[PDB]
Structure formats: structure tokens, C-alpha cells
Amino acid sequence: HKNIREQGRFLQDVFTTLVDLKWPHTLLIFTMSFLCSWLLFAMVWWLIAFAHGDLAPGEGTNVPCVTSIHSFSSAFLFSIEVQVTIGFGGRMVTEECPLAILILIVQNIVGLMINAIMLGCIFMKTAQAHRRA
Amino acid sequence: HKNIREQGRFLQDVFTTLVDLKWPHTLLIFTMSFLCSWLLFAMVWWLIAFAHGDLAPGEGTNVPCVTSIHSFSSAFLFSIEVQVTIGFGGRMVTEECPLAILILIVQNIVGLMINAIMLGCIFMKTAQAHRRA
Amino acid sequence: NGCFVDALNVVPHVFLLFITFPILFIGWGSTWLHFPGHNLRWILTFILLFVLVCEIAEGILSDHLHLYMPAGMAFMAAITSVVYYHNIETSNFPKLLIALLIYWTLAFITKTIKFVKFYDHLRFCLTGLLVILYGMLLLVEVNVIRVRRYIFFKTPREVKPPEDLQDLGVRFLQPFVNLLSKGTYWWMNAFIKTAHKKPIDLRAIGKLPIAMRALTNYQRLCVAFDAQARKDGARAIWRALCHAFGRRLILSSTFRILADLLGFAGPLCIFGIVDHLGKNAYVLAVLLFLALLLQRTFLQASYYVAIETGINLRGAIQTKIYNKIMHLSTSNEMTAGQICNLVAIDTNQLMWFFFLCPNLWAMPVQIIVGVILLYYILGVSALIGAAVIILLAPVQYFVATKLSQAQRSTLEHSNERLKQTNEMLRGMKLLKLYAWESIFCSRVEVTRRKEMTSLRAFAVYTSISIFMNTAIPIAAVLITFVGHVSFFKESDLSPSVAFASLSLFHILVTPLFLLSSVVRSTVKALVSVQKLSEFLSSIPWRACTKYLSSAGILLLSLLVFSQLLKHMVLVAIDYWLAKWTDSDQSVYAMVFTLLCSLGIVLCLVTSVTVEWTGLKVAKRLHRSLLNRIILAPMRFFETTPLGSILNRFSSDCNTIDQHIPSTLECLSRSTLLCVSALTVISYVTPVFLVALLPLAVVCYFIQKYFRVASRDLQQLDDTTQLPLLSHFAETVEGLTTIRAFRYEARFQQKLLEYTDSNNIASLFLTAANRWLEVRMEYIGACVVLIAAATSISNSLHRELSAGLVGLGLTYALMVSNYLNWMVRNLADMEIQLGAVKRIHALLKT
Ligand SMILES: COc1ccc(Cl)cc1C(=O)NCCc1ccc(S(=O)(=O)NC(=O)NC2CCCCC2)cc1
């Protein structure tokens, strides 16, 4: 085909576009979705623990919003611990800071929504029966 | 049928092949998928804790990459604890070793992908309505 | 809380880099829509790239990862903004734009917080520049939403992508691509790759856009001529052309002057680096890399815009003088020949003068900046040197004029010879029926000796030109350095001063030659426009092996070894200057003088050798061709058409004599200079050698794909030139019949068709030349980047030797131009050798 007046419907079919793709591309874009979201929230958590000052190592006169947080690495470990719902519990989010409550209550719902779509679309894929063609 | 020039399309229909199977075979191959992946990552974790030297029981001058790991058994318990997303948290992966972070960040995504396919295909199966035939 | 604000800045780049990856991966797993501010957006994005490089420099100077991460993140954020805008230009959306707008607003907020917290207490200027750029990009996005209806009520009233450059099959899409590719000619990758496999033709070629046709340029020119004649000549037609071609020419000229400025700027940062290490240098190295690439890119865009304006002008005035050919009277043979010369030489003169127009504006500023810069580096002595080089420019012109005179004389003789041939190749049976052929061959050889006699003086002038070309660079350094230290003030000449002077000497020698040709072209174009106004208002190695074996073993080695020795002297003089620098100064200067004398003597010897050898080869080849054609059977002469047999002698001989010696000399000088420069930059830094062999192999792949197309397009040009001119002549003779039949419309249609078919070819050819130029130049800048990056560390931290970096930097700043000379002269030599091969094809009859 030549000279297609693309009005954008090619991407407007957002998931009916990528459910057409091969397996390596679809697996790549799924891992990239997951890693993108995880890194986003790990950054925001690192920042919030830095900003509260709980990141500054100090004994007493405070309780960290997230108990036992030290560096970026442990923060990314907390992000993957709460996002993908393993819940290790070595670092505890506490009832002292409601801002952390908000970040958790949006983290989890976005996690659940993107998990729901990334399951429905892979299943809609496994009904590729062109192989039977 | 006799003398089928198999060019491999019989297996190239990877999941549209096994969604045809009976229930005992499909349940067998699903438990074998899950146990295969779990044992693979339990072995690699046992090895990484051995290699860091955190496996050598010693008090001080170190912190294990995974707190409270002693033997292969507890390592396989850690593998099933993080893979299938129960997250017991008795053994804690720590922010001292980024190699353990990498093994976790691939463990979880492969776990999620194989969980997604092993749900989509069983559902694509429960639309077997030949019984209605 | 400095680290806190650094992190707050890192966040939005991360947000954008994370949203870009799904869409970019879907898009990575033919209608171009452009938006207002596109070119402004790309310009601002390149300015962002520059400021981000500066921020990385600051972060290196300070070091604390979290303190310089913001620059490294904005870098990927701007590149991903470019990727987004490419994905939107390819397919339009209202949402991706808002996705950019969010990021712009958040980055502006973070930069504002940084600025406030700094005000309460180098960083200041960079942060301010970033603020201004992000704000202007925000305003661009606001303009874009204001244009269409993304946030507005439902409908856009969207443009309906431009059919001029995107409708029905067309291939030359210059005006309709991304403003980065408008500079780097990336759209030619597909054409040249397809051209490698399938032979190009007019069916495989595109059709000219509506922006440049016979009709468009004729319309603009006639509108200007109308607006100028309604207010009522040579000056009139001139001003009409000027006002008609307007903005494009001055745009090219200003591109050109900015490039000239940055080119004069390069050697000064070289000087600064050389100073710093002997007593803040990595920054200067990366700045040198950036400035080289930008200067050369702007130079090339300037060339192309000028060439396109010239092609427009040629098409316009051609169809105009054809429109005039319809209304002329019958009372006005000689006029037909004058008309067809008015299209074959006068119009080409006009168009090539329009090529060289911006060079005439950019040359004076170049020589002025050069002289003022070299004065402040070498002092009063510099002035003396600045005279010598300049003195070569008028002399050159004089030399050129002599050439022309000689040419005229030679041409005369040549013409007569052709006459004395046309008889023999027609009375063939008559001639051989009584064997009077040798009697006429004696006369033909008598003419040939006179022709040979003229050629000696012509080649002597060519030799003098080539000799001065490389003699003045040596003489400048000789009479400047000997006249600076051991004459005036005994000032300690740091390596930086000498090597910066060397660089500036080459950067000033390159433009000087062009001024002479520019003056000649300008006066000739003035005469041709006066004339127009008076009228309008009434190949394997075997071909070269045989070519050089016709010379004999006597002169082959005498040429090759002399060239090798001249280049060895030209490198050894600088090698000894390197040891001269650090400080027996008098003995040093005397050795420098000895080397300078050896260089010029050897250059004169080589030039005379090339001249003598070329003349002898032409003689022997012509005599052998004549003798072998004499002894042919009659049926052979009857079988072969006369055009091919006559044509070889008419052109092949002429072409070879006129162009093979000069082009061969230029190719040899270019290839040996390139090899010498590579060896220099290798000896300076050993490890750099191992890094340069990869890149050079890249050039191999760039070679093949070029030639297999550059040849092809070339011949196509020739073909579209042949029926055009002939057509003109047909209209002139049978003019009464054509004005009687009232067939003027169809013939004008045919001539517009022919001039379009000519322009598409002459346009794709310049596009391909620009492509090869820009890519070879990008690699020639990569090599100097890597060379400087290795030299600053290896030759300072460990080796601690300062005389090295000078030679390496000075040769790597210029290796690219020698590379380009090499490749272009190679293409020309190949087409000329392919022309020669048919002479040997005729020799075996
Ligand atoms: C030799 O360079 C220069 C170096 C420095 C300066 Cl300050 C100016 C020039 C220069 O040349 N002045 C600009 C005008 C100009 C003319 C020819 C060329 S060109 O490259 O030789 N030729 C082509 O591009 N296309 C040809 C054009 C004729 C029809 C067939 C295709 C490039 C540019």
C-alpha cells in the first residue's frame, strides 16, 4: 500500500495493534511497561523519603515514613515489594505520614490496572489461530 | 492419516496444541512448568548466596544479600516465597548486593509472564464446548 | 537543599522517558504533516543539546553523581522529545502533543525553583539559557494547540497533508522532510541503496516538485520583470533577477558566513588545548568536535541552497528566452548559432556565477578574520606572513588568464586537424584504392606537431599553478617563523603558536584559490547577461596500466618516487618543527630552512615530470591510433558508423589532453596527503591508530554505493542535455512553419518537459554529491574527536610529551578535506579512464 492518509487510527487501536505483533516484540513491550512503572514509583518514593528527612540517618526524634530505608537501592526494593504484591515487610510504611498513604493508594491501583490489561491482551493474543491457518 | 510431511507446525501451534489436550495432561504440564521455573531460580539463588560467601555462617563483618539464609532448603523456600508472590519476609533481600536485585527483577517478570500465559490458556480451554457437542 | 533540587529536576525527565517507551516501541515494532514551529523546534532542540553538553562539562568540573545527573537525563529527554516529534510528524495526534506539553511545563517549574534558590545565594548562565529555551519551546507548543483544535472544540479544520510533495509518484523530496535531514540528506540513503542494485533511469527517477519547475521560476521571474518594466535594459533585468530570487540566496550566504566564522574559530581552541597541557581541555576537545560538525554542516547546506537557486535561475531564464524565440522577426544562420551558444555557454556561465555568488560575499570576511586572528597569535611577524599568502591570490589570477589565452590558440589548431580527418574517413575506398593514405597521414602528423607545441606552454602554466599551490604554504611558514624568532624579538615560540599558525595557513590557503575563479566567473557572467539583454530585447587497472606503460619505465618511477619523497619532506618539516618548539634555536631554524628549500625544489621537479609524461603519452597514443586505423580492411570501415570512429579522435583525444594530467596529479597529491596525515596521527598517538582503522573501513562501504550511482546519474545528465539544445535549433530554422501552424503551445510544453528532465538530473547529482560530502565529513570529524580524546590523556598523563599533540591536532583538523579531494578526484579519474578504454578498444582493429 502507498499513500495512506494516516489520521492516527493505526495507533488509536492501541491494544488491537500490539496484540497483532510477534512474541518477542510483545514480550519486550510488556517488560518495558512493567519496568517503566516500577522505576517511576521507585523514584518518587526515594524522593519522598529524602524530602521528609527520614532519609537522613538519625536515631530518635523521628520515625521514618517507611521504616528501615537507607538508599535508592532499598527504595527500589520497596517499590517492587509493594507494586507486584509480594509484600516483604522488612521495610514498613507507617501511619505517621499520610502522603505515603496517598502514594501507596495510587501505586496499587495503577499496578492493578496495568496488570489487568497486560493479562487480557496476552490472552486475546493466545487466540491467534492463524497458525491453524 | 499416513505419511504427513511434518514441517513442525504440529508444535509451532505451541499453546493451541496443548489447549486441545485432556485435563490430566494439561494439569501435569502446568505443574511441570511451575516446578521447573521454581527449581531453576532456587538453584541460581542457592549459588549466588554460596558465592557471595554469605552462605558461610559467620557473625559480623558482613550482611547476607538475603538475610537468614542457611541451606538449600531455605533457599528454595525463598524462591517460592518471592516467585509466587506470597512474600513471607522472614528472609530479607538487602540493598548491599545489586546482583540479587537483578535476579529478583528478572525472576518476578518471568514469573508474571508464565502466570499470564498459564491463565489465558486454561481459560481458552474452558471454552471447550465439544461436550455440548 | 541542593541535592533535593537536583533530584526534583531529575524526576520529570524520568517521567517523559518512561511514557515515551511504550509508544516508541509500538511505532518501532506515506504522508508528511508539518506543524508551525517545526524548524524552530528543531533549532531550539539543537541549542538544548549544546547547553546540555555544557552542563555535563560543569558536572565533570565539580566532581557526587546526583549533582550532575540532571544534564544526563535532560539529554535523553530531549532526544526522546525528538523521537516523539518524529512519530508525530509521521502520524498526527492531538494527544502526543499534550504529552509533550506536560513535560515542558514541569521542567520549567523545576528550573524556576533552581533559579530562585541560586539567586538567594558559571551555573547561573547555563541555568538561565535552559530556562529561556524551555520557555520558547512551551510557547511553540501553545502555538501548535492554538493552530488546530486539540484542546479546542471538536474539529481541527486540519490541513489535509500537502499534495505538492506527497501526492503522485515523486522521489526528490527535499522540501518535505525533517529539518535535520534537510541538513544531513538522510533521505538519500534509500535512493542510493536501491540505486546500488537496480540501474537508475527516468522511470526510476522522481519528478520535480511544484516548488521548482519551469512554470514556477518563469512565473516569479516574469512577475519581477513586469513589476520592474511597468516603472520604466541590463540593470533592469539584473535587479529583476535579484528581487525575484531574493531570500534563498541571502539565506545561503549567511549560512556560509557563519560557517566561515566557526572554521576560523576551530584552530583557536586547538591553541588553547595545546597551552593548557604544556602548563579545562576535555571541554575544549568536545567543543572542537561540536564546532567542526556544525561548521561543516552549515557549509554544506549553504552550497546546496545556492546550487538550487542557480538551477531555478537556469530553468527560468531558459524558458524565458525560449518564450522570446516565438515573437522574434525573421530578418534577425549566425543568429541561430549565437542563440544556441546563448543557451550552451552563456546560460551555464550565468548559473555557475550564481553558484559562486555567496562565495564572493563570504571570502572577504574570511581573509579579514584570518589576518586579524593570526596577528594576535604571532604579533608583527604575522603581518609579514599574512602578506605572502595573500600575494598568491592575484598572481594565481594572472596565471589563469595565460592559460585561457593558450587554450584559445590550441583550440584553433585542433579544429583544423579535425577537418583534415573528416576527408580521410569519408573517401576511405577512394583513399585505399591507390594507397595515397600515407601521403595524407604525413600531413595529419604535420598538424599534430603544431598542436603539441601549443600544449607545452599550457602544461607549463598548469605546472606553475600546481607548484605555487603547495609552495606558498611552505614559504609562508618559512619566512614567518625564521622572520619571527631569529629576526625580531627572540620570543619563545610555544608549540601552540606555531601549530595554530599552521592550521590558519591551511584554512586560509583553501579559500584563496577560489577568489580568482570567482572574479573570472563574475566578469564573464556580467558579459553574458549583457549579451542576454541585447538578445532578449530585439574500470579495471588494465586501462591505466596501458596508459602508464605507453609512457615507459623511464618516467613512471621518476614520477612515483618523486611524489613519495615530496610528501615525506612535507611531513618531515613539521616533524622537525615539533622538536623545534620546546626550548640551540638557531641551528633549529637553519634546519627548518633547509627542509623548506627541499620541499619547493622537489615540488617543481614533480610538476615538470607530470607535464612531460602526459605530453609524451598523448603523442604516442595519437600516433598509434592513427597507424592502427590506417591498416584496417574496407569492410570494417563500411560496417562501423562514422560517428564512433570520428568521435574518438574528436573528443577522447581532446578530453585526455585537456584533463587527464591535471586530474591525475590532483588524485596523486590527495591520496598521498591523506596517507601521510593518517601516518602522522598514528605516530603521534599509537593507540589512536588502532581506533582509526575501523572508521576507515566504514568509508569503504561509503565508496561502492557512491560510485555505482554517481557514475549513473552523471551519464543521465549528459543525455538530458543533448535533445534539449538540439530542440532549440529545430525551432530556430523552421520558425515560420511553427508560427504558421500555430503549434507554439505544444512546443512550449515540450520544452518545459525537456528542461524539467534536465533539472531533475542536474539536481539529483548535486544532492548525491552533498550526501557523500556530509557523511565523509562527519567521519572526518569523528576521527579528530577520537584523536584529541586519546592525545589529551595518553600524551599528557602518561607520556608527558607536548610536541606530539600539536602535529596530531593540526593534521586531524584538516584530514577531512584531503579525504574529500581524494574521493571526488577518484570518481573523475574513473570516468575519464572509462573514456580512455574505448581508444584501446579501437586500437585492436
Ligand atoms: C570547491 O568547493 C568550494 C569550496 C569553498 C567555497 Cl567558499 C566554495 C566552493 C564552491 O564550490 N562554491 C559553491 C558553488 C559550487 C559549485 C559546484 C559544486 S560541486 O560540488 O562541485 N558540484 C555539485 O554539487 N553539483 C554539480 C553542479 C553543476 C551541475 C552538476 C552537479 C559545489 C558548490
Half-sphere exposure of C516 (CA within 13 A, CB side): 18
Residue of A nearest to C66 (CA): A72
Q: Is C touching A (3+ C-beta pairs, cut-off 8 A)?
A: yes
Alpha helices by DSSP H, listed for C631-743, are: 634-639, 642-647, 653-684, 686-733, 735-741
Q: Calculate the alpha carbon distances from A44 to A48, A79, C12, C344 in Å.
A: 6, 9, 10, 72
* Beta carbons within 10 angstroms of residue C385's beta carbon: 25
First to last CA, chain B: 24
What is the length of chain A? Answer: 133
**Cell digits for C242?**
535579484
For residue B75, give the CATH number of its domain: 1.10.287.70
A89 within a domain of the structure (yes/no): yes
Q: Calculate the alpha carbon distances from C505 to C152, C389, C510, C512, C723 in Å.
A: 60, 8, 9, 11, 47
Taking the C-alpha atoms of residue C574 and residue C498, their distance in angstroms, rounded to an integer, is 10
Tell me if A119 and B119 make a contact (CB, 8 A cut-off): yes
**How close A82 gets to chain B, by Cα (Å)?**
10
Kindly calculate the radius of gyration of chain A based on its CA atoms and give it in whole angstroms.
20
User: How far apart are the CA of C303 and the centre of ligand 1, in A?
Assistant: 7
Alpha helices by DSSP H, listed for chain A, are: 9-12, 14-18, 23-52, 72-83, 98-126
Has A132 been labeled as part of a binding site?
Answer: no
For residues B69 and B75, the answer to whether their CB atoms sit within 8 Å is: yes
**Cell digits for B57?**
555462617
Residue (of C292, C315, C293, C295) closest to C303 by Cα position: C295
Kindly list the residues from chain B whose CB atom is less than 8 angstroms away from the CB atom of residue A132. 13, 16
**How close A7 gets to chain B, by Cα (Å)?**
33
For residues C500 and C604, the answer to whether their CB atoms sit within 8 Å is: no
DSSP designation for A131: G
Has C654 been labeled as part of a binding site?
Answer: no
Taking the C-alpha atoms of residue A91 and residue A75, their distance in angstroms, rounded to an integer, is 9
Residue (of B69, B80, B63, B67) closest to B46 by Cα position: B69
Q: Is the CB of C303 inside a 6 Å radius of any atom of ligand 1?
A: yes
User: How far apart are the CA of C518 and the centre of ligand 1, in A?
Assistant: 12
Phi-psi region of B53 (alpha: psi -120 to 50; beta: other; left: phi over 0): left
Tell me if A85 and B85 make a contact (CB, 8 A cut-off): yes
For residues C795 and C685, the answer to whether their CB atoms sit within 8 Å is: yes
Render C431-498 in DSSP notation, one character per residue.
Answer: HHHHT-HHHHHHHHHHHHHHHHHHHHHHHHHHHHHHHHHHHHHHHHHHHHHTTTIIIII-----HHHH
**Cell digits for A128?**
491467534
A133 within a domain of the structure (yes/no): no
Has A85 been labeled as part of a binding site?
Answer: yes
Tell me if C93 and A8 make a contact (CB, 8 A cut-off): yes
For residues C363 and C511, the answer to whether their CB atoms sit within 8 Å is: yes
Kindly list the residues from chain A whose CB atom is less than 8 angstroms away from the CB atom of residue C26. 11, 14, 17-18, 29
DSSP designation for A56: S
For residues C339 and C325, the answer to whether their CB atoms sit within 8 Å is: yes
Render B109-131 in DSSP notation, one character per residue.
Answer: HHHHHHHHHHHHHHHHHHT--GG
**Cell digits for C163?**
499534495
A108 within a domain of the structure (yes/no): yes
For residues C84 and C18, the answer to whether their CB atoms sit within 8 Å is: no
For residue C63, give the amino acid letter.
Answer: D
Sign of the CA dihedral running C53, A36, A16, A108: negative
Subunits with 3+ Cβ pairs within 8 Å of A are: B, C
Structure resolution, Å:
4.1
Taking the C-alpha atoms of residue C433 and residue C303, their distance in angstroms, rounded to an integer, is 60
B105 within a domain of the structure (yes/no): yes
DSSP designation for C200: P
B133 within a domain of the structure (yes/no): no
Taking the C-alpha atoms of residue C460 and residue C406, their distance in angstroms, rounded to an integer, is 11
Taking the C-alpha atoms of residue C622 and residue C614, their distance in angstroms, rounded to an integer, is 12
Domain hosting A92: range is 1-128
Tell me if A11 and C93 make a contact (CB, 8 A cut-off): yes
For residues C479 and C385, the answer to whether their CB atoms sit within 8 Å is: yes
Number of domains in chain B: 1
Tell me if C18 and A39 make a contact (CB, 8 A cut-off): yes
How far, rounded to the nearest angstrom, does the alpha carbon of residue C695 sit from its chain's CA centroid?
21
**CA C256 to ligand 1: nearest atom:** 7
Own/partner pairs for A59-64, CB < 8 Å, 24+ apart?
Answer: A63/A94, A63/A96, A64/A94
Pocket test for ligand 1, best of C357, C519, C766 (most atoms within 8 A of CB): C766
Select from A71, A89, A115 the Cβ nearest to the Cβ of B89: A89
**How close A86 gets to chain C, by Cα (Å)?**
23
Kindly calculate the radius of gyration of chain C based on its CA atoms and give it in whole angstroms.
31
For residue C99, give the amino acid letter.
Answer: A
3-state class of C788 per DSSP? Answer: helix
Has B88 been labeled as part of a binding site?
Answer: yes
